[PDB]
Amino acid sequence: QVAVLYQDVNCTEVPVATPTWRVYSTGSNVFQTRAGCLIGAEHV
Amino acid sequence: GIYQTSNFRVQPTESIVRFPNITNLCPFGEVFNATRFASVYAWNRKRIS
Amino acid sequence: GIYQTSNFRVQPTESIVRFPNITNLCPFGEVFNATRFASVYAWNRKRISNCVADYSVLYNSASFSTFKCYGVSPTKLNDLCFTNVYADSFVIRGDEVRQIAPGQTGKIADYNYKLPDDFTGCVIAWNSNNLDSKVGGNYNYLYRLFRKSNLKPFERDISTEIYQAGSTPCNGVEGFNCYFPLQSYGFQPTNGVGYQPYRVVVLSFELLHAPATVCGPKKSTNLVKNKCVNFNFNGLTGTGVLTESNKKFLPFQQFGRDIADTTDAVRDPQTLEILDITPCSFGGVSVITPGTNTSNQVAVLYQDVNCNVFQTRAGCLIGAEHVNNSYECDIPIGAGICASYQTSQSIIAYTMSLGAENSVAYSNNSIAIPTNFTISVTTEILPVSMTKTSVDCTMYICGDSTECSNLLLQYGSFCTQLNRALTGIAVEQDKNTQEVFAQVKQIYKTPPIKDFGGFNFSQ
Amino acid sequence: QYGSFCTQLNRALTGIAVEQDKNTQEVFAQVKQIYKTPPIKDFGGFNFSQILPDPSKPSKRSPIEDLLFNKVTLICAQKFNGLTVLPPLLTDEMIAQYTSALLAGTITSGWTFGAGPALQIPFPMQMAYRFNGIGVTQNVLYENQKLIANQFNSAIGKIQDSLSSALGKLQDVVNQNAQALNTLVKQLSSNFGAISSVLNDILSRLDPPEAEVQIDRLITGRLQSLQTYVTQQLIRAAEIRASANLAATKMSECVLGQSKRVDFCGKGYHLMSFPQSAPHGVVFLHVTYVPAQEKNFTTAPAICHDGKAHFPREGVFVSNGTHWFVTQRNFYEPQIITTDNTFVSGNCDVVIGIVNNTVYDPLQPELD
Amino acid sequence: KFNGLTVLPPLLTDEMIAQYTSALLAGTITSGWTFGAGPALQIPFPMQMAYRFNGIGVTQNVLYENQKLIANQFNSAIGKIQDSLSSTPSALGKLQDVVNQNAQALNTLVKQLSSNFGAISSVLNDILSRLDPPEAEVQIDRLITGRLQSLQTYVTQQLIRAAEIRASANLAATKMSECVLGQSKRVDFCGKGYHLMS
Amino acid sequence: QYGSFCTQLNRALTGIAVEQDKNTQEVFAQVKQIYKTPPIKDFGGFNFSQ
Amino acid sequence: GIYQTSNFRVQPTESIVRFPNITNLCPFGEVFNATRFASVYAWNRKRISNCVADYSVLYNSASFSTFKCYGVSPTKLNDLCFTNVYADSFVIRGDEVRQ
Ligand SMILES: *[C@@H]1O[C@H](CO)[C@@H](O[C@@H]2O[C@H](CO)[C@@H](O)[C@H](O)[C@H]2NC(C)=O)[C@H](O)[C@H]1NC(C)=O
Ligand SMILES: *[C@@H]1O[C@H](CO)[C@@H](O)[C@H](O)[C@H]1NC(C)=O
Ligand SMILES: *[C@@H]1O[C@H](CO)[C@@H](O)[C@H](O)[C@H]1NC(C)=O
Ligand SMILES: *[C@@H]1O[C@H](CO)[C@@H](O)[C@H](O)[C@H]1NC(C)=O
Ligand SMILES: *[C@@H]1O[C@H](CO)[C@@H](O)[C@H](O)[C@H]1NC(C)=O
Ligand SMILES: *[C@@H]1O[C@H](CO)[C@@H](O)[C@H](O)[C@H]1NC(C)=O
Ligand SMILES: *[C@@H]1O[C@H](CO)[C@@H](O)[C@H](O)[C@H]1NC(C)=O
Ligand SMILES: *[C@@H]1O[C@H](CO)[C@@H](O)[C@H](O)[C@H]1NC(C)=O
Ligand SMILES: *[C@@H]1O[C@H](CO)[C@@H](O)[C@H](O)[C@H]1NC(C)=O
Ligand SMILES: *[C@@H]1O[C@H](CO)[C@@H](O)[C@H](O)[C@H]1NC(C)=O
Ligand SMILES: *[C@@H]1O[C@H](CO)[C@@H](O)[C@H](O)[C@H]1NC(C)=O
């Protein structure tokens, strides 16, 4: 398991930008942090 | 650890055209058609529309 | 404060010459056009030097070939007059043309002029149908077909014993597998519409220096110096202001260059006189201003000038006057001199001051002891973290384009060594604010009643 | 049209040039006053005439400084083709004056001249302050003041013999910087694959529109050569800055005070340092203190008697062979073991190594 | 061992640097710091600690009165460090990185020889067999310029890299003299706590 | 004809090679002699055998 | 001190040349030496591919004059082979060879 991270993104413009990538496109747990919007990790 | 791989891009989604309402016609004619000329000395640059 | 802007510059306003009389030798046209030229198989060596040059050809007549082997500002060349004229003459089929040129190596490149590179002098292969052709065939020209190939550029092939490609020796015969070591021209004016005889005589100057022989007429106007000018003397034109040449020189040493190819080679053929070229003062610039708030007054500071002007080791200060007394440094000008806005009014540049000078007495028995004290408080600002931006690499470098993903990868994954480190900067930003403030591990709280024996912490 | 490629290259070299002024200031400019030695030179035997400026020489540089200046050395005349050397902000005359101020303070105003009012005391009574800082009591100096002075005088005068025999650290920087810049001027002769290496030599042959490619080849050639020198020098200037920062620290603690680091301002215990100006650097004459002629004794943790232990105030118990003496740490000065210089603790039944011995009770003679 | 590349051994062989390490260990236990500051002396180790304890403030009676406790902790502590180095591979991380970095940078320098750099081919032989001396030449120039920049960036990286390594060597030389050849009073120079000996 | 770009890399590169020898020389070479541990190794309890 | 002056690398002793065979065994031989040759009006061809060709000839046997058309390495071939075969079959009058 991995937690992809993006630098310049919010929780809306990530999904728009083989089937595997669609899993992280929408995301069941999205965190918006300073460094960006890291995908796959749950904040506690 | 944390590693970096690539950078996701976003592509366009449409394109169009827009031009004025002007139209003429000189397909190598009005501009390029014989037009008897004078000697080399009288080579004035005539103006065309 | 003090700022810097565009510096100062000067421009020469003279370029007189004095030497022309470039002899009269005119063998250029001789090679250009003469009796029928020899065949491509055998060349003819000709050298032109110490001549008037007279670059009145190529642009003249017509046909000819391109150059692709020159510098800047073409015209009749002139100015730089090169060093040698390797005049080569021969006759080719005329249809090839591009064979003797920079590239397009076909079959003619076997043993014919390879044109290694540079080949200063280009080629003048024009069209000559009336000459070099006869109704009775007019063979004359005889060139070999192929012999081992790659016969080197400057290596004329005049020999025998044709290759005779095979598993057996030539045996000095011309029969089965034994071809002739020569190809007959055999072209007449009637046949060969595109293969009619053409005359080409290539030249090589191996340019090596501006001031040299084989020059073109100039203007012995006169000789000037000591003004920082760029007069046009022979091939060279100088740069800076001339000076006396105290260095010793010898008759076979008329060119000067130590490490930077300075124009010490002005042997002055006109009147043997070695000149020393050196640019004049460059200059500096800096604006000393008290700010657009106080007043719209300034005092320009330069870098190197021999000058209400103050002569400073850092340059010349214009607009600010030095005062014998010294103040505390406000605007650091450099070299221990600081200017400021102090009393009408004007801008004052003075000598920085260290501090008040005081001494303490003593002898074999003495000491100083305080009697009272005074608690003091002073701030000490310290940056801890900086707002970290997250700039990506593609979009910025290249937005949404079809060729965006193809040309981007030509370099590789350099964005890997670009965006990888930027995140590390961001993470380290908070680690700086975590170790600074989160020192204590338990969060305390002051008692509800503020009673600390007289001290007030409300601030 | 190539762009503002080196609109910042001048900023890099200009920034480096300006910083060097800071380096030479933060190091020597440690005092807001210029102290001067008294005309009368009587420092209890010490002879500083070999490090203080001598008025006879107009330059006003001390003999050790004079030796260093002569020791360190086209090279200086490059025909001024795009390159120049900016003079240092403060000349050696100013640097020498700064150094003399530090010497005139440490010699007279000891070190209290860098922490407020510059109180002064006699030098023999200041070396006792510094001797006390390395575990040797004050009296150890005044008994051997004549020997110490005759030992400091000769030792300081032996430095020139070493130097006159050196300055690799300073000489390397001058040579390395000169060599790095020399190749920059020597690389203009390269052709970078073009027809010729002289710009004015290839500006009358080809079409300017068609001549851009040929000249552009040299444009990208020399530009890279210039850029590498800036990058190389920019890196090296950081190396010198770290040394400059190190030098500033030494001039703030080793000289303006007595340090306690084991080996930071010399080999051995630290007493005092004397800065000396050098070309593009500084030379520190650390005055340390090293023991020798040591001897072996027998020691126990604490003397025990009458069921009552006794421990040393500041010193280590020793054994002359039949009696027990309490001596200081470094120097060997035996004393009669007395309760005044030793305290009591424990019960002597738990320690290991206790040796039975008797101490002196002063009250006995008062009741005889 | 690739083309144009070579490696030279260190000044002191590991069989020899162990000689210096052996002497320093042998001199520190039999002569404390005395050998660093003058000739070595015969000050027996059990009481030398009392000298080192006394140098931080604690009286010298603490050593002898608890010599057995001190010795066991010293032996126990030394025994435990062996396991720490061998227990995990990240202990010698700093030494590993320098070797890995240098090797990785060296590999990239050689691997750059394959890149065409805009020329027809990345081999000097085939081009001479397909390009006329002019073509070959006018195209080889674009080949050398690529390699020189690739090689030059390697030299610069070593200069940048070597400078940071020389910082540690200076610190290792200074830390070794102050820590091994004496007791350091610096709060953080010889590990957490009051320095005793290294 | 490309110039002295070739030599500068070689001479500069060798500088790091000689530098390494100077780094080790100033780290381990802290004693002017050689010391050998005594045959008997009774150190009052401490074990240096590690 | 020590100065790294130059390098002394060992040069290759020789160069070994040979072909790995590969797609080979050309039937090209059964073209010139055959029986029942066609006429001039009749047209014939024999495509040859997936083989070694092995032109040879010209410098082998007797007769078989050349045609004066070569590029690199004239009368050598090998380097230039062209992926095509055209085995035309016809007989000229015998006196129009240049025709
Ligand atoms: C080496 O240091 C250790 C420190 O305790 C000791 O060696 C131990 O000796 C005992 C006695 O036989 C053994 O049971 C242990 O296995 C040894 N090692 C350890 C880690 O406890 C001893 O003080 C020193 N000397 C020797 C010869 O080992
Ligand atoms: C990020 O994008 C979301 C998408 O709706 C938006 O609501 C939000 O305001 C943006 N900014 C932040 C800081 O979340
Ligand atoms: C001007 O533009 C209009 C559309 O906006 C077009 O209908 C009209 O024909 C144009 N006028 C001309 C072509 O003269
Ligand atoms: C302008 O006035 C003074 C000029 O010295 C300056 O200190 C102040 O901050 C400025 N104030 C405004 C409102 O511009
Ligand atoms: C500056 O000019 C004056 C004018 O005569 C001259 O004397 C002086 O030498 C010049 N400066 C230098 C450094 O030569
Ligand atoms: C500054 O001092 C010099 C020294 O004599 C003197 O000549 C000069 O006049 C003084 N400055 C002014 C403004 O008087
Ligand atoms: C406090 O300082 C003043 C002088 O500033 C002195 O007169 C006074 O005695 C001091 N305080 C006391 C308690 O002496
Ligand atoms: C004490 O004072 C006398 C007065 O002449 C002087 O000669 C002597 O040097 C002084 N002692 C010290 C230690 O300064
Ligand atoms: C111990 O001190 C006594 C003092 O009288 C002296 O005679 C004796 O020699 C000393 N011990 C030795 C071993 O000399
Ligand atoms: C020291 O004195 C005590 C007092 O009784 C005695 O028990 C002990 O044996 C003495 N030490 C020695 C070494 O005899
Ligand atoms: C036809 O005869 C020739 C003449 O020797 C010989 O090569 C072979 O028998 C036949 N040709 C081929 C290609 O096999």
Give residue A14 CA to ligand 2 midpoint distance, Å: 12
- Tell whether F19 is within 8 A of chain E (Cβ): yes
Measured between beta carbons, which residues in chain D are less than 8 angstroms from residue C362?
Answer: 119-121
Q: b/e map of C332-342 (b: 16 or more CB within 10 Å)? A: ebbbbbbbbbe
Positive or negative, the Cα torsion across F33, F39, F40, F42?
positive
As beta bridge partners, residue C86 has C47, C204
d(CA C212, CA C19): 12
**Which tokens in the block code for residue C206?**
């191996």
On chain F, the residues whose CB falls within 8 A of the CB of D225 are 5
User: Which residues have CB under 8 Å from C178's CB, separation 6+?
Assistant: C162, C164, C170, C171
Pocket of ligand 8 contains residue D122 by CB under 6 Å? yes
- Which phi and psi angles does C368 have, rounded to 5°? -115, 130
A interface test, pick of C390, C392, C404, C429 with most A CB neighbours within 10 Å: C390
**Rounded CA separation A8/B7 (Å):** 10
Tokens of D220: 């990208």
Max CA-CA distance within chain D?
A: 124
Question: Do residues C184 and C70 touch, judged by C-beta distance below 8 A?
Answer: no
Expressed in Å, this structure's resolution amounts to 3.8
Pairing of strands D308-312, D316-319: unpaired
Q: Which residues lie across from C203 on neighbouring strands? A: C87
**Spatial distance between the Cα atoms of F20 and D95, rounded to a whole number of angstroms:** 35
- Two tokens, residue E162: 């070597």
CA distance F44 to G20: 78
Written as six digits, the tokens of D63 are 């003999």
- Closest ligand by atom to D356 CA: 10
List the structure tokens of C112.
């014919």
| Euclidean distance between CA atoms C414 and C421, whole angstroms | 12
User: The dihedral of CA D200, D201, D207, D209: what is its sign?
Assistant: negative
| Residue that has been written with the tokens 């011309």 in this structure | C174
For the sheet containing C203-204, what is the strand order? C45-47, C86-88, C203-204
- CB within 8 A of C444, min separation 6: which ones? none
**Among E125, E153, E159, E103, which Cα is nearest to F5's?**
E153
CA of C109: which chain G residue's CA is closest? G72
Query: Which residue is listed with tokens 């590789």?
Result: C412
Under DSSP, the state recorded for D360 is B
Closest of E26, E29, E16, E34 to residue E74, by C-alpha? E29
Q: Ligand 7 centre from C372 Cα, in Å?
A: 5
Burial of C350 (0-12, 13-18, 19+ CB in 10 A): buried
d(CA D265, CA D261): 8
In the structure, do chain A and chain G come into contact, i.e. share 3 or more CB pairs under 8 Å?
A: no
Which among D269, E82, E180, E186 is positioned nearest to F28, based on CA atoms? E180
Q: What percent helix, strand, coil does chain G show, rounded to 5?
A: 5, 0, 95
Report d(CA C387, CA B43) in Å as an integer: 68
Touching B: which chains, 3+ CB pairs < 8 A? A, C
Which distant-in-sequence residues (6+ apart) come within 8 Å of C307 by Cβ? C316
Distance of CA G27 from the midpoint of ligand 11 (Å): 12
What the block records as the tokens of G19 is 């072909």
The separation between CA C113 and the C-alpha centre of its own chain, rounded to angstroms, equals 32
Identify residue D301 by its one-letter amino acid code. P
- Backbone φ and ψ of C332, nearest 5°: -70, 110
H or E stretch covering E105: helix E93-111
Inter-chain contact B9–C400, Cβ cutoff 8 Å?
Answer: yes
> Obtained via which technique?
cryo-EM
D288: exposed, middle or buried (C-beta count within 10 Å: 0-12, 13-18, 19+)?
middle
CA quadruple E123, E125, E127, E131: dihedral, nearest 10: 170
Burial class (CB in 10 A: 0-12, 13-18, 19+), C144: buried
Select from A5, A7, A34 the Cβ nearest to the Cβ of C392: A7
CA of G41 to the centre of ligand 5 (A): 104
Q: From the CA of E47, how far away is ligand 10's center (Å)?
A: 23
C67 touches chain D (CB under 8 A): yes
Gap between the Cα atoms of C45 and C88, Å rounded: 5
Mark residue F6 as left, alpha or beta (left: phi above 0; alpha: psi -120 to 50; beta: remaining): alpha
Residue C364 near ligand 8, beta carbon < 6 Å: yes
Phi, psi of E67 (to 5 degrees): -65, -40
Cβ-based neighbour number of residue C425 at 10 Å: 13
**β-strand pairing of D324-327 with D316-319:** antiparallel
With both helix axes pointing from N to C terminus, report the angle between D208-253 and D9-28 in degrees, rounded to the nearest 10.
Answer: 10
Task: For strands D355-356 and D303-305, give the pairing.
Answer: parallel
Burial label for C406, CB within 10 Å (0-12, 13-18, 19+), is: exposed
CA atoms within 13 A on the CB side of D74: 6
Q: Which two tokens stand for residue D32?
A: 């807001």
Question: F41 vs chain E: nearest CA distance in angstroms?
Answer: 10
Q: Phi first, then psi: what are they for D355, rounded to 5°?
A: -120, 125
Distance CA E64, CA E46 (A): 8
What residues have CB less than 8 Å from F41, skipping those under 6 apart? F48, F49
- For E70-78, the CB contacts below 8 A with 24+ separation are E70/F45, E71/F44, E71/F45, E71/F46, E72/F45, E74/F46, E74/F47, E75/F45, E75/F46, E75/F47, E78/F47, E78/F48, E78/F50
Conformational region of residue G78, where left means phi above 0, alpha means psi within -120 to 50, and beta covers everything else:
left
Nearest CA owner, ligand 8 atom 10 = C364
F1-12 burial code (b ≥16 CB/10 A, e <16)? eebebeebbeeb
Q: Which of C289, C292, C293, C297 to mutate to test the pocket of ligand 4 (most atoms within 8 A of CB)?
A: C293
C420 to chain B nearest CA, in Å?
A: 5
Contact partners, residue D258, CB within 8 Å, separation at least 6: D111, D130, D133, D270, D271, D272
Structure tokens at C456: 């007030």
Residue D31's nearest CA partner among D245, D266, D255 is D255
Nearest to E196 by CA among E63, E92, E96: E63
What chain C residue is nearest to E133 in terms of C-alpha separation?
C116
Backbone dihedral region of B45: left (phi > 0), alpha (psi from -120 to 50 degrees) or beta?
Answer: beta
Min Cα separation D190/chain F (Å) = 4
Q: State the Cα–Cα distance between residues E30 and E53, nearest whole angstrom.
A: 17
Contact D81 C279 (CB under 8 A): yes
Look-up of token digits 């015998």: G94
Helix runs in chain A, H state only: 19-26
Instruction: Report the greatest alpha carbon distance in chain A.
Output: 31
Cβ–Cβ < 8 Å for C207, D196? yes
Cβ-count burial D157-166 (b if 16+ within 10 Å, e if not): eebeeeeeee
Q: Tell me if D88 sits within 8 A of C334, measured CB to CB.
A: no
Q: Token pair for residue C286? A: 């800096």
CA atoms of C41 and C234, how far apart (whole Å): 38
Helix (H, G, I), strand (E, B) or coil at D326: strand
Cα–Cα distance, A40 to A42 (Å, whole number): 7
Helix, strand, or coil (residue D270): strand
Q: How far is the CA of D304 from the centre of ligand 10 (A)?
A: 9
- For residues E55 and C184, what is the distance between their CA atoms, to the nearest angstrom? 106
- Interface contact E156-D264, CB threshold 8 A: no
Query: Would you call A7 and C391 a contact, using CB atoms and an 8 Å cutoff?
Result: yes
> Interhelix angle for F5-28 vs E133-175, to 10°?
20
Amino acid in position D357: N
Q: Using CA positions, which residue lies closest to atom 2 of ligand 9? A: D320
Q: Which of G26, G28, G32 to mutate to test the pocket of ligand 11 (most atoms within 8 A of CB)?
A: G32
Place of tokens 């003091």: C376
CA distances from A18 to A5, A13, A23, D239, F39 (A): 19, 19, 10, 51, 72
What single string gives the DSSP state of each residue in C288-300?
E---TTT-S--EE
Q: Report DSSP state, residue C38.
A: P
Give residue numbers after which chain D breaks (C–N above 2.5 Å). Answer: 73, 165
For G36, the 3-state DSSP assignment is coil
Measured in angstroms, the CA of C113 and the nearest CA of chain E are apart by: 11
Q: Residue C114: its chain E contacts at CB < 8 A?
A: 132-133
Tell me which residue has its CA closest to atom 7 in ligand 4.
Answer: C293
- Paired tokens of D114: 């860098």
Contact D205 C235 (CB under 8 A): no
What is the DSSP pairing of strand C337-340 with strand C90-92?
unpaired
Distance D85 CA to ligand 5 centre (A): 18
* Chain CA centroid to CA C92, Å: 39
How big is chain E, counted in residues?
198
Strand order across the C337-340 sheet: C320-322, C347-351, C337-340, C331-334
Q: What length is written for chain B?
A: 49
**Which backbone phi and psi does C360 adopt, to 5 degrees?**
-130, 130
* Residue D90: strand, helix, or coil: coil
The DSSP line for E110-133 is: HHGGG--TTSS-S-HHHHHTTS-H
F9: left (phi over 0), alpha (psi -120 to 50) or beta: alpha
C166 shares contact with chain E (CB less than 8 Å)? no
Phi first, then psi, for residue E169 (nearest 5°) are -60, -40
Structure tokens at C352: 């920085």
- The pick from G25, G26, G31, G33 for probing ligand 11's pocket by mutation, whose C-beta has the most ligand atoms within 8 angstroms, reads G33
- E28's CB contacts (< 8 A; 6+ apart) are E35, E180, E181, E197
Cα C411 to ligand 6 centroid, rounded to whole Å: 67
In C273-394, beta strands by DSSP E: 276-278, 286-288, 299-301, 309-312, 315-318, 320-322, 331-334, 337-340, 347-351
Name the helix (H) or strand (E) containing C371: none
> What is the CB neighbour count within 10 angstroms for residue C321?
15
Of D173, D170, D169, D182, the C-alpha closest to D229 is D182
Q: Is D201 within 8 Å of C262 when comparing Cβ atoms? A: no
- Cβ contact D217:D194 at 8 Å: yes
CA distance B23 to chain C (A): 32
Q: What is the distance, to the nearest Å, from the Cα of residue D142 to the centroid of all Cα atoms in its chain?
A: 28
Is residue D193 within 8 Å of residue E145, measured between CB atoms? Answer: yes
Structure tokens at D144: 């051997």
Q: Which of C108, C141, C110, C145 is nearest to C123 (CA)?
A: C108
Contacts of D58 (CB under 8 A, 6+ apart): none
Nearest in space to C413 (alpha carbons), one of C394, C395, C390: C394
CA angle C172, C178, C181 (to 5 degrees): 75
Question: For residues D250 and D27, is the Cβ–Cβ distance under 8 A?
Answer: no
CB atoms within 10 A of CB G37: 11
Query: Cα–Cα distance between F2 and F9 in angstroms, integer?
Result: 13
Q: D322 and D361 in contact (C-beta within 8 Å)? A: no
The continuous run of DSSP H or E covering D72 comes out as none
Number of CB atoms found within 10 A of residue E11's CB: 16
Q: Which of D218, D228, D189, D221 is nearest to D13 (CA)?
A: D228
Helix axes F5-28 and E14-31, enclosed angle (nearest 10): 30
**Cβ neighbours of G4 in F, within 8 Å:** 10, 14, 17
φ and ψ at residue E177, rounded to 5 degrees:
-70, -45
Strand, helix or coil for residue E178: helix
C-alpha radius of gyration, chain D, whole number = 32
- Which residue(s) pair with D366 in the sheet? none
Contact between chain A and chain B (3 or more Cβ pairs less than 8 Å apart): yes
D295 lines ligand 9 (CB under 6 A): no
Cβ pair C88, C203 in contact under 8 A: yes
How far, in Å, CA of A44 to CA of C390, rounded? 24
Residue pair D312/E58 in contact (Cβ under 8 Å)? The answer is no
Size of interface A-C (CB pairs under 8 A): 20
**DSSP conformation class of F22:** H
Give the H/E segment covering residue C383.
none
> Residue D366 has which token pair?
């008062």
Please say whether the dihedral angle defined by the alpha carbons of residues F30, F35, F40 and F44, taken in this order, is positive or negative.
negative
From the number of C-beta atoms within 10 Å of its C-beta (0-12, 13-18, 19+), residue C346 rates as middle
Burial of D270 (0-12, 13-18, 19+ CB in 10 A): buried
The number of helices, as runs of H, and strands, as runs of E, in chain A is 1, 0
Rg of chain B on CA atoms, in Å: 27
Contact call for residues C289 and C349 (beta carbons, < 8 A): no
- Describe the crossing of helices E133-175 and D208-253 by its angle, rounded to 10 degrees: 10
Q: Which residue, C189, F14, G80, D333, is CA-closest to E162?
A: F14
Residues 6+ apart with CB under 8 A from E105: E154, E157, E158, E161
Confirm or reject contact between C285 and chain D (CB < 8 A).
Answer: no
Distance between the two ends of chain C, CA-based, in angstroms? 35
Q: Which residues line ligand 4 (CB under 6 A)?
A: C 293-294
Question: Could you tell me which of D101, D152, D96, D147 has the C-alpha nearest to residue D272?
Answer: D152
Backbone conformation region of residue G50, classed left if phi is above 0, alpha if psi is from -120 to 50, else beta:
left
| Nearest alpha carbon to residue C341 among C296, C376, C311, C308 | C296
Return the sign of the alpha-carbon dihedral for residues C143, C146, C147, C152. positive
